[PDB]
Amino acid sequence: TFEEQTECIVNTLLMDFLSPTLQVASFDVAIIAGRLRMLGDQFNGELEASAKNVIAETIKGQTGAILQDTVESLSKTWCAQDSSLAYERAFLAVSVKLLEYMAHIAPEVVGQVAIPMTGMINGNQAIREFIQGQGGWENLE
């Protein structure tokens, strides 16, 4: 169900970015999507370089490798310059804001990133353990 919840959340986030009509016209994913977006906007680091690389490998069909390394690099950088921020919270924040920038910059291909990011979040124990330790997606933020 956690794996299925992650899938819905990443789909909702993406559909809201791509189509605001669908956001308006449509376990409450809408509230969760809101809190992850509120969290996502706390990241102000440079994304142009990151987004382009993740998009480029996503076309080629090597999203998994570059996507995780990109978010882990940006999160370690942000955690290095902010002692208060937990790594696992930084990770999610970057994942959301990177998905946001990739939708604005490349809406024709951003959809091919949804499954990789779903697999990334569901596959990472540190992030899964963190979210479930906050009372699951339902109570995160």
UniProtKB/Swiss-Prot annotation:
<protein>
    <recommendedName>
        <fullName>Bcl-2-like protein 15</fullName>
    </recommendedName>
</protein>
<keyword id="KW-0053">Apoptosis</keyword>
<dbReference type="InterPro" id="IPR036834">
    <property type="entry name" value="Bcl-2-like_sf"/>
</dbReference>
<dbReference type="GO" id="GO:0005634">
    <property type="term" value="C:nucleus"/>
</dbReference>
<dbReference type="InterPro" id="IPR033543">
    <property type="entry name" value="BCL2L15"/>
</dbReference>
<dbReference type="GO" id="GO:0006915">
    <property type="term" value="P:apoptotic process"/>
</dbReference>
<dbReference type="GO" id="GO:0005829">
    <property type="term" value="C:cytosol"/>
</dbReference>
<dbReference type="GO" id="GO:0042981">
    <property type="term" value="P:regulation of apoptotic process"/>
</dbReference>
